[PDB]
Paper text:
Human serine racemase (hSR) catalyses racemisation of L-serine to D-serine, the latter of which is a co-agonist of the NMDA subtype of glutamate receptors that are important in synaptic plasticity, learning and memory. In mammals, D-serine is synthesised by a pyridoxal-5′-phosphate (PLP)-containing enzyme serine racemase (SR). The first mammalian structures of SR, published in 201031, revealed a dimeric structure with each subunit consisting of a small domain (residues 78–153) and a large domain (residues 4–67 and 156–316). The roles of Ser 84 and Lys 56 as the Si and Re-face acid/bases in the catalytic cycle of hSR are generally accepted.
In this paper we describe the first ‘closed’ crystal structure of hSR bound to ATP. In this structure, Tyr 121 has ‘flipped’ outwards from the core of the small domain, where it is situated in the holoenzyme structures, to form H-bonds with the α-phosphate of ATP at the dimer interface. There is a radical change in conformation of the side-chain of Tyr 121 between the malonate/ATP complex and the holo structure, with the side-chain hydroxyl group ‘moving’ approximately 10 Å from interacting with the α-phosphate of ATP to the main-chain carbonyl of Ser 84. Malonate resides in the substrate binding site with Ser 84 pointing towards the central carbon; in the transition state this carbon is planar (see quinonoid intermediate). The binding site for ATP is in a pocket between the two subunits. The adenine ring sits between Ala A117 (from the α5 helix in the small domain of the A-subunit) and Arg B277 from the large domain of the B-subunit. Residues from both the large and small domains of the A-subunit make a number of hydrogen bonds to oxygens on the ribose and the α-phosphate of ATP. The β and γ phosphates of the ATP interact with the B-subunit, accepting hydrogen bonds from residues at the N-terminus of the α2 helix (main-chain NHs from Ser B32 and Ile B33, and sidechain OHs from Ser B31 and Ser B32). A magnesium ion, coordinated by two oxygens from the β and γ phosphates of the ATP and four waters, does not directly contact the protein but helps orient the β and γ phosphates of the ATP, facilitating the interaction with the N-terminus of the α2-helix from subunit B. In the malonate/ATP ‘closed’ complex, the C-terminal residues are better ordered and Trp 325 has good density and reasonable temperature factors.
Author numbering:
A (entry chain AAA): 4 to 67, 75 to 330
B (entry chain BBB): 4 to 69, 75 to 327
The structure:
């Protein structure tokens, strides 16, 4: 028994299928050549609010009249929860790290939420959200540890398994592990021979360290990574699922993330945020070569497209 | 009559369909809200080589194989890449004449697809003259980016798709450079559904098409244009001008700032990495002058013509 069940994911699908489009799966002959795999890209960047977080947000809201919804977010969960709350006429307060990209801070306010900045650490996020929840008498909807959220994210895999029936592996970027855990439950329940692989920045590598050690090891210092959506540590609800049901974790460096993100931009014309480049970098990575040649058909989740163009100017690289 | 007919477009479709993408039409609630219209975006940025030019290039190569020592053209980059790809499929060397001031991303892709690149001065005259000389030197066949009939016919296949995907469209909005796409679309639309408006969108900083229509004669750009819309610096030509004169309903000019704003809006709201030239059509629908367009012209298809953007080049203006 885990904090969600397959049944939870099925119910989540029922709860949100009238509210979100089924995002496309796209392909690139070039990326296929570069990796020597048969790649399929699940385009969550086209989801309402620009990331898959709409799934968990809609599921959580439908599963909840309350005075307000509250959460902490690097931006995507915040935008998504604000939109879902607004559908129901519920006020939203989003606790956001000071260092979040401007595009995410501005979008949250565009959708009508009150934004409250916190310090960029797990502790500050959690503590400030708890206080805001107390002060507003709101309902806290955690970005990755809330069962209704995790089950919502898992619906990605229901779609993938139908869109790509012969898939051999899903590759999933991991932060708090909400998406990874929901996908792992879904894939392992329906099609256990399909691999579930996590992709994680080296600069925020708690999930990798945790799996290696076989115990939950949160990030010690606040992470600094261009993959701004996966700075969260994994938590007590998602760790057991990841521990038991995820096949392997691949870490990728800042430079690998930057190169893979630009590659998708230039070759596929999909404006993924760098956090979504993490999964692409994983498949391009040296260690991924160790993956059996039999694992041919790989679906990478392009998890979001909320990228700060003015910020991306710092690191955009000319061909060398 | 004109240098192509609808039968030419139909034939082009037969010639190329097995080799190209039927590109999607995407939408955005936000862009609808901002413009007050119901917009349909024809996503040629997902075409092979990153723009619609694969259509004209494949058509020309398939039409003109009946093999030369080489194919030659001049291009700001998109036609160059497309022709190189089409030629490579047939084992034919490519020579592309490219203005010095073309984006690096385009210069490098042409080289990556295996062509020889020859830089020219950034003018209509230099492009045409150097391409002529290279054709003669290589004993190649010249495939013009916008005045070659097989190229015009190929580009018009966009409209065949649009009219099936968006059957009750009220207007198409099309960025114009040399007028190959505009003319091919105009021919197809006015043949199949003449009540559908065909509108061109053009940078004010390269506004020969607008000036031509305004003055009722071909008025090429007098100075080399300077515009972020790097793929529409070409003047319209002798084969496309009569089609545009007679069959295009209106031309909307847009400033550099409007192009930048519309390009970023598509990036941020729709996550489609259009090049700024493809932003020209979006900026037109957002422009003050487009507000003079009747409210009954509500359902509008904009051609997102390419996605070949130089991100290093974009740093200067991205804000
Ligand atoms: N004010 C804003 N500032 C920055 N980004 C914004 C702003 N408003 C919306 N966005 C971004 O625009 C993208 C699209 O938003 P959203 O999904 O709400 O609209 P849409 O794409 O028009 O909707 P649909 O595709 O369902 O018609 C998201 O990535 C969102 O973050
Ligand atoms: N070396 C390169 N430098 C920059 N851009 C490149 C380079 N090679 C290819 N591109 C760009 O990559 C994009 C995709 O290229 P292309 O259509 O040939 O392949 P693909 O997208 O992998 O193919 P498909 O979608 O049919 O599987 C195009 O915009 C092209 O300009
Ligand atoms: Mg492609
Ligand atoms: Mg981590
Ligand atoms: Mg959208
Ligand atoms: Mg012009």
């Amino acid at each position: 028994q885990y904090d969600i069940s397959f049944a939870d994911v099925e119910k989540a699908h029922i709860n949100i299928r009238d509210s979100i489009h089924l995002t496309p799966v796209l392909t690139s002959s070039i990326l296929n050549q570069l990796t020597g795999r048969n790649l399929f890209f699940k385009c969550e960047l086209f989801q309402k609010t620009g990331s898959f977080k709409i799934r968990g947000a809609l599921n959580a809201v439908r599963s909840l009249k309350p005075k307000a919804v509250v959460t902490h977010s690097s931006g995507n969960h915040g935008q998504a929860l604000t939109y879902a709350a607004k559908l129901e006429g519920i006020p939203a307060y989003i606790v956001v790290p000071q260092t979040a990209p401007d595009c995410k801070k501005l979008a949250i306010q565009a959708y009508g939420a009150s934004i409250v900045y916190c310090e960029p650490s797990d502790e500050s996020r959690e503590n400030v959200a708890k206080r805001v929840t107390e002060e507003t008498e709101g309902i806290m909807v955690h970005p990755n540890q809330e069962p209704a959220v995790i089950a919502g994210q898992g619906t990605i895999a229901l779609e993938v398994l139908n869109q790509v029936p012969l898939v051999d592996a899903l590759v999933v970027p991991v932060g708090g592990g909400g998406m990874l855990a929901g996908i792992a439950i879904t894939v392992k329940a329906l099609k256990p021979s399909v691999k579930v692989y996590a992709a994680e920045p080296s600069n925020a590598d708690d999930c990798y360290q945790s799996k290696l050690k076989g115990k939950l090891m949160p990030n010690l210092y606040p992470p600094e990574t261009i993959a701004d959506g996966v700075k969260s540590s994994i938590g007590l609800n998602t760790w057991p699922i990841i521990r038991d049901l995820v096949d392997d974790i691949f870490t990728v460096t800042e430079d690998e993330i930057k190169c893979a993100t630009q590659l998708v931009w230039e070759r596929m014309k999909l404006l993924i945020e760098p956090t979504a480049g993490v999964g692409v970098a994983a498949v391009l990575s040296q260690h991924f070569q160790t993956v059996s040649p039999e694992v041919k058909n790989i679906c990478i989740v392009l998890s979001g497209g909320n990228v700060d163009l003015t910020s991306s100017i710092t690191w955009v690289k000319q061909a060398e």
